Ligand binder design. Structure first.
Ligand SMILES: [Mg+2]
Length: 128
């Protein structure tokens, strides 16, 4: 994928945002911004230019599933890739995420190799 691809990393835990941003740096993606919940995320996305979202599942104000649904219903962002991150895999959340249009779902903490693999599989099915 274009290494200038602009990511938005969404998590209420500033520490995890830092970690994910650094994992992306380790993969050659330097163009990354952060958001602290689903509402903040939408405010940042409105500026345009974003090509990928990585979002935590449980957040106050607007959670990850609601963010995903809002993204998917939007004209401009309808096809914006969204990778959902969760502290623990729950079969019901996986289904809900998939049927709501999630591009993928990963359990944290994850290694750089795992993130790379998730992103690459998403890039490959979307032709990025
Ligand atoms: Mg959280």
């Amino acid at each position: 994928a274009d290494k200038e691809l602009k990511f938005l990393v969404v998590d209420d835990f500033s520490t995890m945002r830092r970690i994910v941003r650094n994992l992306l740096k380790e993969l050659g993606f330097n163009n990354v911004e952060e958001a602290e919940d689903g509402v903040d995320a939408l405010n940042k996305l409105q500026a345009g230019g974003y090509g990928f979202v990585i979002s935590d599942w449980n957040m106050p104000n607007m959670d990850g599933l609601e963010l995903l649904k809002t993204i998917r219903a939007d004209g401009a962002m309808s096809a914006l890739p969204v990778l959902m991150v969760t502290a623990e895999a729950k079969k019901e959340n996986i289904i809900a995420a998939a049927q709501a249009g999630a591009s993928g779902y990963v359990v944290k903490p994850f290694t750089p190799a795992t993130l790379e693999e998730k992103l690459n599989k998403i890039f490959e099915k979307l032709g990025m």
